[PDB]
Amino acid sequence: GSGTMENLSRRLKVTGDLFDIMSG
Amino acid sequence: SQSNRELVVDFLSYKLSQKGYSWSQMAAVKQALREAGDEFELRYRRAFSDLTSQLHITPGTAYQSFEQVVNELFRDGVNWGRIVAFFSFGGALCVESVDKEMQVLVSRIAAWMATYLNDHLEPWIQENGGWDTFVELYGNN
Numbered sequence: 001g002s003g004t005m006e007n008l009s010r011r012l013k014v015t016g017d018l019f020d021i022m023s024g
Numbered sequence: 025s026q027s028n029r030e031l032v033v034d035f036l037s038y039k040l041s042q043k044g045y046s047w048s049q050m051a052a053v054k055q056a057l058r059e060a061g062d063e064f065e066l067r068y069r070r071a072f073s074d075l076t077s078q079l080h081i082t083p084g085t086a087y088q089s090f091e092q093v094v095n096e097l098f099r100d101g102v103n104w105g106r107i108v109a110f111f112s113f114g115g116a117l118c119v120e121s122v123d124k125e126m127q128v129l130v131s132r133i134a135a136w137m138a139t140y141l142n143d144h145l146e147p148w149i150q151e152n153g154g155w156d157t158f159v160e161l162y163g164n165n
Contacts, residue, residue, distance in 0.1 A: 004079050005079065005089060005096070008113075009092070009094075009096035009097050010096075011071075012110075013097055015064060015109055016064070016105035019108060
């Protein structure tokens with residue numbers, strides 16, 4: 001459904017964010 | 025023959041990168057991005073279920089799904105890591121499109137990505153050191 005999207009964006013944002021922070 | 029030229033270039037680039045060298049700055053960015061994608065996807069699967077099949081992609085709703093996911097991704101900010109997430113998302117969209125035989129979406133997904141980079145990410149990118157900074161930070165990983 002559409003709730004899948006919110007959930008996907010969130011998982012992508014945290015994963016990226018952690019990825020960004022771990023390269024600083 | 026450009027075909028042969030491109031071949032030689034691709035091959036030489038690959039061989040240089042395997043030694044920590046680079047054919048050109050563009051080549052190093054590519055290599056850095058590919059590696060960051062693999063790493064990002066690895067860290068994603070070990071925590072969640074494949075970013076690929078989840079959404080129900082169709083030619084008609086593909087764009088809208090891409091836009092919703094992508095706008096929430098950079099709603100409250102842009103950073104290299106999110107950009108890598110972005111690239112990996114587009115990649116899973118294409119893999120899913122081919123699995124489901126909607127091969128024609130790959131060039132569209134490609135276009136929507138370049139467009140979104142050119143319009144919404146470039147500014148931040150130039151402002152934050154350009155791709156060369158990205159290479160310093162995620163290169164040879």
